[PDB]
Design a protein around this ligand. Structure first.
Ligand SMILES: [Zn+2]
Ligand SMILES: [Zn+2]
Lengths: 119, 50, 161, 49, 116, 121, 170
């Protein structure tokens, strides 16, 4: 009891993707690489982790996360299975793309109104 | 022997907001089996049965 | 009158006590002999200890600090005015020598600690409709869950279905 | 149909009471009950209510 | 007060304290190098049994832009005076016993934090 | 189960409870700071307690007031115990019960830097 | 639990624990190493002789001494290791197959310190910098957890779990 489990009717598991397009897209932006960066500049910044690999450092999470979300919404460079996590308390953007990440689809609500209109 | 814990970061379920120690947000089932149950309290009742 | 002593340590302690008692000039206003009071305090300390060891020096230092404490000159004024006999002052403890505000704060802290150390009483609906068979009294408290009966005075524990 | 009214009134009263307890705990008025910490006594009061 | 680590000048390593027996002063020597420097804090170690840590120093201004954090209008800011503001508990383990909130202003270029 | 009059009143039972409860420095101490004060009379910190009483280092172990009152202790017994437990090797200069801060001063008289850390721990 | 991507070698585990109890001495349990090794020796083996560099990789801000007092004990514990060669020898001496000579032990230590531990960040010829930064991040997270500033990570939280469907299983 409790060990055996069954998926939900809407539950879906990610099949898996590649991290190369995400790395290239984050590298084009003003993102200093972790190999060449002043250690003192890590405090006032946010650490980006992709598939558990610490790479690059950014100075504007509020815009980077929005850009990533819009890009995923447009389905052009990042597949719908990828997930970008935003940690507010500690500045860390941990992105994952490996398989096995159980997920489900949810509607989007910008301010107080959904996008699933009559159209 | 305690109320529903905070499985997520400082909240029971994603629906409720953080630091919501109210009764309905910690397992208190306000409805009854005759008048149906809210999904959140339904899940908490399932946890108790488990 | 405190008997004179030829011991250097006793004389130094008496001089220190007299000097401390002179702080604030309360002696002039009260017209009390500071030297006599210091000699009496030293004699009482010597009688209580009966040796010029580290304990006597520590007691003398504590008395000097308490008498010279500018945060509670009331104790010094009372000592110089006869309110606290020298024997009592020498035999008094640190808690007793504290100022009025400090004593009140200590009492409040002790009362709060005593209250917090207690345990919350078991809740229940107290009523006199149930007669306890272990004491014959009617006072008791019940709890519905089967209704458990808890005796108030005797403490008879039972249940009714 | 009247028991429903009584039950709803009681539930609303309990909700108001627990909200007031939470407000008091937030503004630092609920003193710790003897033998228990602040969170423990807060939880005990909520459960009793 | 506290004490911070001060690295060496040449080898850049931990400087251990040393009580100069000759001049009767406090020095900081290097295990490897022979560097010396005259001290100024006159302290070596401090322990905080109560661990009276100011939670406000840990809170950051970025907490305001949190979509899953409550907001209230009855606790306006002080500096800018904006109305919207967030509030939350310490959200830190080892909480002794207190749910005291830590209000943070919800507006750009302010990042103010206070408590009531 | 209390036997004496303490069984009735809680005032005379709190002391019994305290004496049956384990109390250590950690429960009553609030801050502990070591200083390499060369001359005892120099007193790098502002405290008028050493000159009245009279090694180039000391420990300033200030105690809390609320806990000490809750357990109902006095600095005299604390100093006596801390001096007898470690032999006649240190000299604890306690403070009067009138000041606001419950500061202390532990000094050693007769590798030496970590000895104070080890003993305080 | 590190694992690059469906690689031939199995996933490797890195336990950077700390003694309870001097007190507060951080250790590590590297793969193919039966005994424990302090984190400072590991950092020096990765190619960081200077102490300031090691602390910068571990701790990001120096204005909080309250965090510095926790690392000072373990930092001073390993004070007889400065050069890289001695650190490599010390790490290899605890290896499962201790080389009869010194060169074999150095080679074994370098191999285990560049292929077994943290293979996901990189297993190429020059990736010691990223490995050191990842180790420093692990130590920083451990210290933050110890201070209580960040709650621990729940074991049953599915957010830290992965499902192996027919694909990976086959
Ligand atoms: Zn040096
Ligand atoms: Zn503001």
């Amino acid at each position: 009891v409790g060990l055996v489990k069954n998926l939900a009717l809407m539950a879906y598991i990610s099949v898996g993707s590649q991290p190369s397009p995400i790395l290239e897209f984050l590298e084009e932006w003003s993102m200093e690489n972790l190999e060449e960066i002043s250690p003192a500049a890590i405090a006032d910044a946010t650490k980006i982790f992709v598939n558990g690999c610490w790479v690059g450092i950014h100075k504007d999470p509020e815009q980077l996360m929005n850009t990533l979300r819009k890009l995923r919404r447009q389905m052009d460079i990042i597949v719908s299975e990828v997930s970008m996590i935003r940690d507010i308390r500690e500045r860390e953007i941990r992105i994952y793309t490996d398989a096995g990440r159980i997920c489900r689809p949810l509607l989007i609500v910008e301010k107080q109104k959904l996008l699933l209109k009559k159209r | 022997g305690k109320r529903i814990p905070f499985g997520f970061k400082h909240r029971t379920l994603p629906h409720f907001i953080k630091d919501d120690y109210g009764p309905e947000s910690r397992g208190f089932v306000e409805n009854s089996y005759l008048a149906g149950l809210t999904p959140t309290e339904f899940f908490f009742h399932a946890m108790g049965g488990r | 009158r405190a008997p004179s002593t030829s011991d250097s340590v006793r004389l130094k302690c008496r001089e220190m006590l007299a000097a401390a008692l002179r702080t604030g000039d309360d002696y002039i206003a009260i017209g009390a002999d500071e030297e006599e009071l210091g000699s009496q305090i030293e004699e009482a300390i010597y009688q209580e200890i009966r040796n010029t060891d580290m304990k006597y020096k520590n007691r003398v230092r504590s008395r000097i600090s308490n008498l010279k404490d500018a945060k509670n000159p009331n104790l010094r004024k009372n000592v110089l005015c006869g309110n606290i006999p020298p024997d009592l002052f020498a035999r008094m403890t640190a808690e007793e020598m504290a100022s009025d505000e400090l004593k009140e704060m200590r009492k409040n802290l002790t009362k709060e600690a005593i209250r917090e150390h207690q345990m919350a009483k078991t809740g229940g609906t107290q009523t006199d409709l149930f007669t306890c068979g272990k004491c014959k009294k009617k006072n008791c408290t019940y709890t519905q869950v089967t209704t458990f009966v808890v005796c108030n005075e005797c403490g008879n524990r039972w249940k009714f279905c | 149909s009247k028991t429903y009214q009584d039950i709803q009134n009681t539930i609303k009263k309990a909700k108001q009471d627990v909200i007031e307890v939470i407000e008091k705990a937030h503004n630092n008025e609920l003193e710790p009950t003897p033998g228990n910490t602040l969170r423990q006594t807060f939880e005990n009061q909520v459960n009793r209510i | 007060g506290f004490v911070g680590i001060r690295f060496c000048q040449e080898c850049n390593n931990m400087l251990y304290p040393k009580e100069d027996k000759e001049n009767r002063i406090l020095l900081y020597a290097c295990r490897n190098c022979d560097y010396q420097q005259e001290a100024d804090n006159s302290c070596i170690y401090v322990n905080k049994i109560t661990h009276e840590v100011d939670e406000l120093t840990q809170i950051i201004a970025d907490v305001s832009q949190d979509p899953t954090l409550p907001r209230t209008e009855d606790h306006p800011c002080q500096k800018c005076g904006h109305k919207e503001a967030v509030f939350f508990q310490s959200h830190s383990a080892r909480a002794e016993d207190a749910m005291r909130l830590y209000y943070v202003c919800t507006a750009p270029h302010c990042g103010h934090r206070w408590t009531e | 189960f209390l036997l004496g009059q303490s069984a009735r009143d809680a005032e005379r039972a709190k002391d019994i409870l305290c004496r049956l409860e384990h109390t250590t420095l950690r429960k009553v101490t609030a801050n502990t700071a070591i200083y390499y004060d060369p001359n005892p009379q120099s007193t790098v910190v502002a405290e008028d307690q050493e000159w009245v009483n009279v090694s180039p280092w000391l420990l300033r172990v200030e105690l809390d007031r609320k806990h000490m009152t809750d357990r109902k202790l006095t600095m005299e017994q604390i100093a006596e115990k801390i001096n007898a437990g470690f032999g006649d090797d240190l000299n604890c200069i306690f403070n009067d019960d009138n000041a606001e801060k419950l500061v202390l001063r532990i000094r050693i008289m007769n590798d030496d830097d970590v000895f104070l850390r080890c003993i305080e721990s | 639990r590190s694992c690059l991507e469906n690689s031939s070698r199995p996933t490797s585990t890195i336990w950077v624990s700390m003694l309870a109890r001097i007190g507060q001495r951080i250790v590590a349990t590297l793969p193919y190493i039966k005994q424990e090794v302090p984190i400072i020796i590991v950092f020096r083996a990765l190619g960081f002789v200077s102490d300031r560099d090691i602390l910068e990789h571990i701790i990001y801000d120096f204005e909080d001494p309250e965090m510095m007092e926790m690392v000072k004990p373990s930092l001073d514990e390993a004070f007889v290791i400065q050069e890289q060669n001695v650190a490599l020898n010390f790490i290899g001496s605890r290896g499962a197959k201790p080389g009869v000579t010194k060169e074999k032990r150095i080679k074994y230590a370098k191999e285990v310190l560049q292929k077994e531990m943290l293979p996901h960040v990189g297993v190429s010829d020059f990736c010691e910098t990223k490995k050191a930064y990842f180790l420093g991040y692990m130590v920083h997270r451990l210290l933050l957890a110890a201070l209580g500033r960040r709650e621990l990570d729940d074991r049953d939280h599915y957010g830290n779990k992965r499902l192996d469907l027919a694909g990976p299983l086959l």
